[PDB]
Amino acid sequence: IQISTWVASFMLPMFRIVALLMTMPVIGTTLVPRRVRLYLAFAITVVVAPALPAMPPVQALDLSGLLLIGEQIIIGAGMGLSLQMFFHIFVIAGQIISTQMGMGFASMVDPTNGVSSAVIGQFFTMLVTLLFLFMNGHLVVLEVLVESFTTMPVGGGLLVNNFWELANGLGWALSSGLRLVLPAITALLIINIAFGVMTRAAPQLNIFSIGFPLTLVLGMVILWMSMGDILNQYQPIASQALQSLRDMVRAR
Amino acid sequence: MTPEVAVDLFREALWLTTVLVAILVVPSLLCGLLVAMFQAATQINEQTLSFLPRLLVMLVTLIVIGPWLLKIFMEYMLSLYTSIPTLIG
Amino acid sequence: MTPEVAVDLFREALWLTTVLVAILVVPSLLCGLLVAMFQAATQINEQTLSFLPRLLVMLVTLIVIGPWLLKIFMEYMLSLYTSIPTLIG
Amino acid sequence: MTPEVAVDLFREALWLTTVLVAILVVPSLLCGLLVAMFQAATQINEQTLSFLPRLLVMLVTLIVIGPWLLKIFMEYMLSLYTSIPTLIG
Amino acid sequence: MTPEVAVDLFREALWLTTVLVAILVVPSLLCGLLVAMFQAATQINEQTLSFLPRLLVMLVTLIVIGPWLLKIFMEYMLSLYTSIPTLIG
Amino acid sequence: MTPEVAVDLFREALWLTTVLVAILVVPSLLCGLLVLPRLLVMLVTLIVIGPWLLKIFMEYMLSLYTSIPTLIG
Amino acid sequence: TALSFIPAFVMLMTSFTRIIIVFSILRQALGLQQTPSNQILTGMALFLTMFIMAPVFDRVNQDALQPYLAEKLSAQDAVAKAQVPIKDFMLAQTRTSDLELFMRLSKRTDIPTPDAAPLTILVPAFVISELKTAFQIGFMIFIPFLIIDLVVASVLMAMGMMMLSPLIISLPFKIMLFVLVDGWALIVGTLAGSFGGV
Amino acid sequence: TALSFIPAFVMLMTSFTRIIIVFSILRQALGLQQTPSNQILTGMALFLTMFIMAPVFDRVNQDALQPYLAEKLSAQDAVAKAQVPIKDFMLAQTRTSDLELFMRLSKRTDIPTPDAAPLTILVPAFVISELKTAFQIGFMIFIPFLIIDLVVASVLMAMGMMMLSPLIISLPFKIMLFVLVDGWALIVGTLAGSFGGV
Amino acid sequence: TALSFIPAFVMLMTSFTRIIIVFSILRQALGLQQTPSNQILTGMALFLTMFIMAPVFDRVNQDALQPYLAEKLSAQDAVAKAQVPIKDFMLAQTRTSDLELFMRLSKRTDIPTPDAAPLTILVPAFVISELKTAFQIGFMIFIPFLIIDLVVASVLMAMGMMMLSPLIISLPFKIMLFVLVDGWALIVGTLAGSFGGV
Amino acid sequence: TALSFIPAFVMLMTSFTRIIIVFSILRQALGLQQTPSNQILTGMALFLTMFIMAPVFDRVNQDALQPYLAEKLSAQDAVAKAQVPIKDFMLAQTRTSDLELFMRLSKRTDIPTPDAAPLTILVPAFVISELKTAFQIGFMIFIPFLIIDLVVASVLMAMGMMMLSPLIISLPFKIMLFVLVDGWALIVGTLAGSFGGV
Amino acid sequence: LSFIPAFVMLMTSFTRIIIVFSILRQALGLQQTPSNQILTGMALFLTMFIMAPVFDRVNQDALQPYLAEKLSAQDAVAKAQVPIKDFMLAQTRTSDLELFMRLSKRTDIPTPDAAPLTILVPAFVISELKTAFQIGFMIFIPFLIIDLVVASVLMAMGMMMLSPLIISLPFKIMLFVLVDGWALIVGTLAGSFGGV
């Protein structure tokens, strides 16, 4: 060898981009093997490594570059989580619909299959992964991260104490989730109540027998109907989430 | 691949799912409504003579429908897996 | 192995399942109809003297049927597991 | 171990289960029939003065039966777990 | 720990459970019997003026009983969790 | 927690449950005393009550949360 | 042992545990839905933990790392000089009863200061008081969701609507009542306030 | 390798097996809630184990490691000198029936010393007694939560209110009752008391 | 590669697979609980395997290791002389049907001695017989817990009390019944007795 | 490259894939149980591989190793003489449709003999054919356990007794049925019989 | 040690293949233990079969003349870089290339990628993940249909708590056998990869 002196000089942006890729919803969802992700981040870092300063950790304070690596891992994981709650918006929307259809009788035991999310949660997650990938989304994040090294680059790092923002994160996620399925949810509710009137009008209507087949037949239809609007409902949400990333890194 | 294409695909999937579920379930739902008839004629407030006929009719419906439902699904799957390399780009 | 063969196999499975379920359940359903008789003669709007006899008759039916149901299932399983290497190809 | 032996074991299990369920439940069923008496004398079409006495009698029956039911089950379990190494082969 | 001790413990548990359930429920059952009075005086065949007073009286009974039921349960739990290391062996 | 406090909170919550369920169900009870109608009365009651009940529950939830840190100890 | 070292040494001595337990109770207290996924719940709890440990970690950096950017000392007393602030922080929240219990169960020798001279007797006391406080907060935040479950179920059976599983109806009501009351600013403020002395 | 060896030797001869299992019963005994994560339960039980093993490890350090900071011996009799205290400790809690059963199943030779000449026959008896006693304790601490569950279900069913799933309602009641009785100090006390001779 | 091979060896050529599987069935047969953690179950099965192979390992060390502390031979016939005891031992427990089936599917050449000239045809027959016997034992030790489950579910439904999840109510009755019959000493004695000729 | 060498070359070119996949489809087809641990399953698949690859390895040691205990050649044509047996063996089992597909997708030159000149076009063919056959066998052995599942669930529902998790009640019936029909010798003989030309 | 396997995952076909197979293993019944150790080997054999023309050209231009002690650690390495370079260029979407030229900010190269290849590799792997997730969800959809039909039939049977994944696994396997499943997917991978 006798050449590994400049390749390990920076060593910091590698950790930042690795931390982003591990906590991202598409690149880092365990369908990609860790070798691919690690070496992908290595490639991205030999791309972006020009035009950035270094602040070497070389050898002082038995390990101090470890403090600095912790700083950068925190920043990158913050990015990843900030745009992960974005996908969890649609995860939560799909799962509210799935539960209301009647696919969540695994709740009040916890010996069970679980509230089946592979059936609907994976469905909407695939929706969003596709749409996100076809938008500039998967790309803009990278651009965002580049500007990161010019707003809070390295050194003192000026990490931040703003975590509160993304700690308040899931809130709007829940909120956003509602505004996606509100036209569906209400419908389902009515159906339930509608069927309820039947049970009130004619007794001995056992509605493990009749209630849930009807609710599922109509819930699939309602899913198909809301899937029409899903795109025009999605478009502003991605904009808001990418601006959230933009201000999370560009500010401070 | 455009978001429009993703919506195309999920409309295929969801319409196929809802038509399969209707085809499989509606006879069981109707037999449930008929045992509801029976329990409403005489005040038989029972819990399981409403489940057994529904299961019997569901299994009979599976057996009867069977091959042509499987064929519909097979060439839906074949359409998808033959069109993949085009809709990629 | 043809889709026709897969339909053959699932027709075996589903007919065996529905006949097993009928054999096991129909006596319990009949005892439920008979406690429905009893609750319809005198206006006993009750909820569990309709469950206890059904469970007793279900367990008695399991005990009685028992060995020959097990034999039917055993040589169905034996048929499947002896025919596998042929229906493979 | 013969299928005959498996049927032996499941006859033990199912007879023990049905006798335990009868012993535990029949007094509750009888108190339900008695509150059905009460609701049939005067036209009290109620829904829960038929549940409360049944639960009280079920818990009292558990407390009373208690130790000797536990003993029956303990030495049934002991019979099974002492005979395992013989009925293996 | 003897099976006798296990029966001791479950007699504690089941008697506490049945007395708690009686204490909490019997006033609601009595108000249900009283709305049954009301519906029997005039032929009001209704379904929910029998539920609302029962729920109101149940919640009022919880509020009233409250602290001393909680105290009974607290020092039952304290008895159990202080006696555990002795009844272990 | 000093169980007295827990009983206090539980009494508050049970009284709120009583208040809400009463406000919602008593009109249907009266309209069933006079006589599909009762469901319509429930709908009318939901709409006519509307914001102030949700606002009182919002006040109570806000109070619960804003009080948690002190009730801990 | 480095993989077992992280949670036990750091995640135990911080705010993480009560935050993550309150978040789990919430995920259960909330509509029956799962999948806030305990993968963004863990990240969210970790970032709350960092925001709350900001002053603690500031003191740690002041007294340990600020002089030790300069190759001063390695694996010796400075570790105790950094243990001091986190130890005092942990004392600030451990109940007197649990400290008394562990001093009684150690029986070594009455330490003069209220702080436990070894850390390994203060950390489990901290964790026990931590779980107790976390279950306190959890019960508290569960209360109104139980109220909504009860109200909806009462109405549902009051319309003779059996077998409709009023939890399936109460999930949207739960999330609506959880969003109108703003939900997460509240709960996260309660955690961040109950944790420190304001 | 090390992950194959450390768990067995260090968590089956020690108290860990009794503690964690009990805690797991707790996580089941308590409200249906999962996610005290069994990763803070593991660390918490590990601290309780190091805290109960304190006299045992003190005596091992005195008998083996105190003279062996001076390069005295390696991989010889010192290992048996260290085995003796843990052996006597394990013997103190192994039920007589289990030792009799394993001496019967080994059939080698009647060894009069209470400690089993090989640790390989004393350890399984200790682990079996540990499982039996941990199940005893976990069942004990389960009983009152079963009481709360049955009371809640009976009240719901008595309000004509079926299908409200009395378990989701019981969860905050279980948490409340488990906090008011102090819950965790109680159970840590029972463990650390029943395990040793007081 | 040897690192990945050895544990498969200690499982297949020894008692392990019969024990762990049975324990596994127990962890399912017993209350629905997970976390006896299959890491203390694995260690306990390893200890039972050592305790049961004590005579086999004794004979191996007699015929192989006792003369080979003096640099006698390496990677040669001594390995075969060590194969003989474990080979005869495995033969002691393979059912005749499995050996017949594997000689039939090998078709190489008939061997007069019952022992198969290759170890590689004997091991799979031993493993098949082992899994068959393990599932026999596991099912036998499952039956009574099924009885308890049916009893509790039937009682719950018989109180009109649907949707209480009889498994959650049955977990303590399962645990009590499994401690009163002594539970673990029974099963471990059964495993260690059915394995050899007593 | 050894870790990408051994398990890639010899665990795909031999019978390992279909056996291990069938065993996994079994472990799931059998009662919901995990912990046959996929480790004793990997080992049992490896020994069934050694047992089935017996004639192939015999021919390999005939044409390759038998003359090459004598330092004849190295890293040359003897490797192709060793590829010949495994190549024709693989050809004996790849479906015609698959070899057609891969000759079509290669487009290089129409090789006269059925096996294309290199192995890198036959191995993916063999693996796809093996996966298709493994899924055929796995589904075929799954069917009856599905029948037991549906029957048990239907009987539990028809007893008015839902929420009892018919998989936990079906696990013993599955194990019993899988022992009475002898279960394991059936499936192992099926693998080793459908694998080769009998 | 891990430097050599790295450049094979990034530059060659390995990424999208192993990703589609991981989707499958997840797309299929919940089953694990296709073990990702025979999936890695299967994807590596498919990588060899697909890189056959690329590796053929590499051996042509680099290794054929370099059995003869010609040159070492010099321009021959770039002569070997050229074929894989244009191969990767054939599949990187235009957007990723534009973006990485934008992020490098170096001398304008709208013509093919920068010679160091350091700014084509990540663009290739990004377009690779994009196309791999495309195909993955494409083959995942019908298994979702089966999951939903199974779960909705089971619930419509009033038969809950049966974990419809354990009942959907055999139907997934059956449908994946009937449509022949694996040849479809491998042909799709090896055809959508290059120009046909």
TrEMBL record, chain F:
GO BP terms, alphabetized: protein secretion
Matches recorded under InterPro entries: Bac_export_3
Signal peptide start-end: none
Swiss-Prot/TrEMBL keywords: Cell membrane, Cell projection, Cilium, Flagellum, Membrane, Transmembrane, Transmembrane helix
Membrane-related topology note: Multi-pass membrane protein
Keyword Nucleotide-binding attributed: no
Transmembrane segments: 13-35, 36-54
The UniProt record lists the keyword Cell membrane: yes
Compartments it resides in: Cell membrane
GO CC terms in record: plasma membrane
Similarity field: Belongs to the FliQ/MopD/SpaQ family.
Protein name (database record): Flagellar biosynthetic protein FliQ
Lineage of source species: Bacteria, Pseudomonadati, Pseudomonadota, Gammaproteobacteria, Pseudomonadales
Automatic annotation (TrEMBL), chains G, H, I, J:
Record field: transmembrane: 1-26, 137-163, 175-195
Role, per record: Plays a role in the flagellum-specific transport system.
Listed name of the protein: Flagellar biosynthetic protein FliP
Organism phylogeny: Bacteria, Pseudomonadati, Pseudomonadota, Gammaproteobacteria, Pseudomonadales
Keywords on record: Bacterial flagellum, Bacterial flagellum biogenesis, Bacterial flagellum protein export, Cell membrane, Cell projection, Cilium, Flagellum, Membrane, Protein transport, Signal, Transmembrane, Transmembrane helix, Transport
Membrane topology term: Multi-pass membrane protein
Intracellular or extracellular location(s): Cell membrane; Bacterial flagellum basal body
One cellular component (GO) term of this entry: plasma membrane
Any single biological process term in GO: bacterial-type flagellum organization
Principal localisation: membrane
UniProt record similarity statement: Belongs to the FliP/MopC/SpaP family.
Domain of life of the native organism: Bacteria
Primary gene name: fliP
